[PDB]
């Protein structure tokens, strides 16, 4: 999805094999907040939310708690107390097009900043002045969104990155999403310290 209109997928009632995401070298960014990246399997949550979007390289730094900027404030904002992991990778060879991939847009103009995880997808022409735009662009009437010129010839700061943020939410609930469990071979006819489920 476009960063102004990020795609939230809800993950629930499943086994979260966080080890795959952690162990692979496919990611350039793996920033965990409030949790340890190697202990993610032991953390049980009610909901895991995967927010999927594309931004340019220079803006990858904005996908974090406490950050400000065009993305952090007008497109995809994370709370200062965000709990979860931000995972991102260079997608230059996936999204960029020779003539420019302009299907990805971000918000430049807004009346105010976004609340954490607020998804504002309005396309109303932004009124910078006191004169109503009435559907017409012009002086002080600007379309709030702009496209990214993603091209295979761009420098890294202007290459697309695919970002997935896994937000970890614990509610007054059973906590249905946990990682895989360890298991060993069964040993018979010997004294062992055992653990069968609980």
């Amino acid at each position: 999805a476009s960063v102004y209109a990020w795609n939230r997928k809800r993950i629930s009632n499943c086994v979260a094999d966080y080890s795959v995401l952690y162990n692979s070298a496919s990611f350039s960014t793996f920033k965990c907040y409030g949790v340890s990246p190697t202990k993610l399997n032991d953390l049980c949550f009610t909901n895991v939310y995967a927010d999927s979007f594309v931004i340019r390289g220079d803006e990858v730094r904005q996908i974090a708690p406490g950050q400000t900027g065009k993305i952090a404030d007008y497109n995809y904002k994370l709370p200062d107390d965000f709990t979860g992991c931000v995972i991102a990778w260079n997608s230059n060879n996936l999204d960029s097009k020779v003539g420019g991939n302009y299907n990805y847009l971000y918000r430049l103009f807004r009346k105010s900043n976004l609340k954490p995880f607020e998804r504002d997808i309005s396309t109303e022409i932004y009124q910078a002045g006191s004169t109503p735009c009435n559907g017409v662009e012009g002086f002080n009437c600007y379309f709030p969104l702009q496209s990214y010129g993603f091209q295979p010839t761009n420098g890294v700061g202007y290459q697309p990155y695919r970002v997935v943020v896994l937000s970890f939410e614990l509610l007054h609930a059973p906590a249905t999403v946990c990682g895989p469990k360890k298991s060993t071979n069964l040993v018979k006819n010997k004294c062992v310290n055992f653990n069968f489920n609980g």
Epitope: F109, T131, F139, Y142, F143, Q146
Partner: antibody
């Protein structure tokens, strides 16, 4: 709150000139900059403009084909380049912007550069 | 658009009032017309925007209002300048009048 214009230029016919203005004291990135020119003893003519935020441009039809306007937010500067220069392009160039504070902008071009002569 | 600015020259002694006029070649929104004051040798400044509103720093010697006008309630020595109208309707077709 000032828009500071670059110094004068002397160019040959058939070449190009680059002029620029730096914004200071105001929210350049939410603003817009227009470029105009005036020959001595003549009327002020519109050349074109850019929205700083979006980077989108529009031009006067008489210059359109040979004029490009751009910007670089990292230095709060608006730029204009005129190609295929003619002797008739000898004029004082001016730049202007509305005053902006965050997302709130004025309703006209209050901030003007001092004016710079380009000779061809 | 094409804007017509009249009179070509406004000759009037200080202490008196002056009337300036700008004519559109088509019906336009008043919200996009502005008036400028150009003291010779200097960049122009905005006086009136949105046809009727005063710009910051503009004294009550001036006031705003296809036919649009600029009124100078009273002339002081510093109010002798070439006046221009400018139209910003839409993204293109922006222009200035000839200058008073």
């Amino acid at each position: 709150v000032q828009l500071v214009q670059s110094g004068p230029e002397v160019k040959k016919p058939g070449t190009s000139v680059r002029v620029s203005c730096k914004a200071s004291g105001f929210t350049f990135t939410s603003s817009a900059v227009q470029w105009v020119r005036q020959a001595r003893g003549q009327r002020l003519e519109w050349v074109g403009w850019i929205v700083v935020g979006s980077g989108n441009t529009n031009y006067a039809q008489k210059f359109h084909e040979r004029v490009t306007i751009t910007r670089d937010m990292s230095t709060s500067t608006a730029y204009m380049e005129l190609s295929s220069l003619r002797s008739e392009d000898t004029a004082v160039y001016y730049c202007a912007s509305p005053y902006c504070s965050g997302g709130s902008c004025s309703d006209g071009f209050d901030i003007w550069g001092q004016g710079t002569m380009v000779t061809v | 658009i094409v804007l017509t600015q009249t009179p070509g020259t406004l000759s009037l002694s200080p202490g008196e009032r002056a009337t300036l006029s700008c004519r559109a070649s088509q019906s336009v929104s008043s919200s996009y017309l502005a008036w400028y004051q150009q003291k010779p040798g200097q960049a122009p400044r905005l006086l009136i925007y949105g046809a009727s509103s005063r710009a910051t720093g503009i004294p009550d010697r001036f006031s705003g209002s296809t036919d649009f006008t600029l009124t100078i309630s009273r002339l002081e020595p510093e109010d002798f300048a070439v006046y221009y109208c400018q139209q910003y309707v839409g993204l293109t077709g922006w222009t200035f009048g000839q200058g008073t």
